[PDB]
Every structure is written in structure tokens, then in C-alpha cells.
Amino acid sequence: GFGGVFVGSFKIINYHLATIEERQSAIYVDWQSDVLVTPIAAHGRHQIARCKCNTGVYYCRHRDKSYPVCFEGPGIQWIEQNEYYPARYQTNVLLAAGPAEAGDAGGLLVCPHGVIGLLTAGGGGIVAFTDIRNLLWL
Amino acid sequence: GFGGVFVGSFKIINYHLATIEERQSAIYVDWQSDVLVTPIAAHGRHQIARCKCNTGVYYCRHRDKSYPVCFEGPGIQWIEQNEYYPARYQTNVLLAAGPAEAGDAGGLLVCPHGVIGLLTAGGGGIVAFTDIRNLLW
Numbered sequence: 001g002f003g004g005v006f007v008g009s010f011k012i013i014n015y016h017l018a019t020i021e022e023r024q025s026a027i028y029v030d031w032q033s034d035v036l037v038t039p040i041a042a043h044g045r046h047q048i049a050r051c052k053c054n055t056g057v058y059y060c061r062h063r064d065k066s067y068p069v070c071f072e073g074p075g076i077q078w079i080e081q082n083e084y085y086p087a088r089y090q091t092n093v094l095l096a097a098g099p100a101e102a103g104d105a106g107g108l109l110v111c112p113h114g115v116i117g118l119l120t121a122g123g124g125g126i127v128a129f130t131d132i133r134n135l136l137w138l
Numbered sequence: 139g140f141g142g143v144f145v146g147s148f149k150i151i152n153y154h155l156a157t158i159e160e161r162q163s164a165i166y167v168d169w170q171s172d173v174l175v176t177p178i179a180a181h182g183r184h185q186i187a188r189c190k191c192n193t194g195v196y197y198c199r200h201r202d203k204s205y206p207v208c209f210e211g212p213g214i215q216w217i218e219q220n221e222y223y224p225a226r227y228q229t230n231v232l233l234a235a236g237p238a239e240a241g242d243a244g245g246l247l248v249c250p251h252g253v254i255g256l257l258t259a260g261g262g263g264i265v266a267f268t269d270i271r272n273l274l275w
């Protein structure tokens with residue numbers, strides 16, 4: 001439930017966690033929503049949820065535990081935790097209450113329909129995800 | 139968020155929602171846990187969780203809504219009377235608190251590691267799934 005989404009031969013990861021090579025091969029990139037889609041050699045079978053679920057379960061890494069959360073629908077939110085990014089509005093942000101700290105970014109938030117998003121930032125009982133439900137042919 | 143679990147080149151479905159063709163072709167069947175596994179032509183969509191999670195999110199079809207659950211872990215449980223499977227014990231049961239009515243069978247219960255089980259029964263404030271995390275080798 002960590003790393004990123006492996007939908008076939010394309011990897012979805014946070015913009016702030018991508019490598020130089022991934023940036024060189026990237027097909028979709030969004031600094032505002034902190035997302036990057038690039039072709040990779042590690043083929044996978046993850047699926048993107050083409051749904052409207054507002055409830056899900058996400059993997060927290062510094063606890064190695066899965067936490068269910070009801071989260072607020074995707075929208076523009078003011079975020080200053082990821083000091084990689086300065087205090088700014090991010091787009092496609094899902095906010096919820098739950099454990100999250102440095103290094104948890106990239107963990108999977110999923111619902112029965114598939115992957116909803118990727119953990120972006122978190123601190124002090126608040127966890128944030130980037131909503132990927134409109135990526136790779138929404 | 140309903141119907142089978144399509145993994146690799148197999149479909150994993152409820153025993154009582156299985157068709158004749160897939161019952162005859164199945165490489166695995168277990169009536170006591172309500173499970174059937176058969177090769178499927180369709181390409182993979184899902185992954186089987188190989189975890190010890192006691193928490194997940196399941197899809198209730200009669201409300202078209204996902205709900206989060208904490209379940210006790212696989213075990214043997216008494217299942218009350220049902221249309222296809224009358225009152226009896228069922229094996230590899232996960233039990234949780236949530237809505238459930240007739241026809242909700244086949245809903246997916248999932249976690250970040252993949253699909254954990256399928257809804258098999260439910261009434262009052264209790265819902266019960268079949269654990270599929272043991273279909274290895």
C-alpha cells in the first residue's frame with residue numbers, strides 16, 4: 001500500500017517524490033496537485049477508482065497500519081506541511097483526520113472501486129491525499 | 139465494487155452467486171465458506187490481499203455506498219436462515235458492524251493491500267464477509 005499506483009506500465013507518484021529519470025520520462029505532471037505519471041518497467045495491476053466515494057482506507061507507513069477515514073471531497077486547500085512545498089493552495093486535495101508524518105507520502109488510499117488517491121502530506125492528526133480519480137483517461 | 143474478484147487469469151466469487159459453467163470449470167470450491175475460484179478469460183483487475191488487516195472498507199450495494207469496518211478476523215460463525223444458504227455455520231467469516239440487506243452479497247471488502255473478502259450475509263447491525271486472503275499456491 002506504499003510507493004505509488006502501478007497501473008500497468010505507468011506509475012503514478014507524488015510530484016515531490018519523483019526522480020530525475022521519472023521527470024525525463026513523465027507523461028503527466030502537476031506541481032499544483034503534486035502528481036506525476038510516467039512509464040516504468042515495473043508492470044502492475046492497480047486500478048483507478050472512477051467513483052465518487054468519500055470514504056476510504058489508507059496505508060500509514062510510520063505505523064505500518066491501515067486506517068479508514070471519511071474525507072472531504074476534492075478541492076483547493078491551503079497546505080503548509082510539506083516544506084518541500086512552500087505554504088500554498090494545492091488542487092485535488094482530500095483532507096481527513098488520521099495519522100500521517102514525514103515519509104508516509106505515497107501510501108495508497110483506496111475504496112472498493114480502486115485507488116482514490118495518494119498521501120501527499122500530513123501532521124497533527126490531519127492527513128491529505130491527492131485525488132487521482134481523473135487520471136489516465138478519467 | 140460488486141461481483142467477482144478478477145485476479146490474473148482467475149475469478150473468485152461467492153459459492154451461491156456462481157454460474158453453472160464456472161461451477162463446472164472451477165479449480166476450487168468450498169460451500170462451507172461460500173467460495174469458488176475458476177479460471178476466467180477476462181484480464182486481471184484485482185489483487186488478493188496477503189495481509190493481517192482487521193480493518194477495511196466494503197461496498198454496500200443496497201445503499202450504493204462504501205462503509206469502513208473493523209472485523210474480528212477469520213473464524214467460524216453461525217449464519218442465520220438465508221434464501222439460498224439456510225441457517226448454519228460458515229467458515230472463514232469476517233464479522234463487522236455495518237448495514238446489510240438481501241442482495242448485498244458480492245460486495246467487495248478491500249484494504250490498501252487489495253481485496254480481503256466478499257460480503258456473504260448481514261442483518262441488523264452486523265455484516266459478514268468471506269476471507270479470500272488464503273487462496274495461495
Ligand SMILES: [Zn+2]
Nearest residue numbers: 051053111113
Ligand atoms: Zn469508490
Ligand SMILES: [Zn+2]
Nearest residue numbers: 189191249251
Ligand atoms: Zn491489508
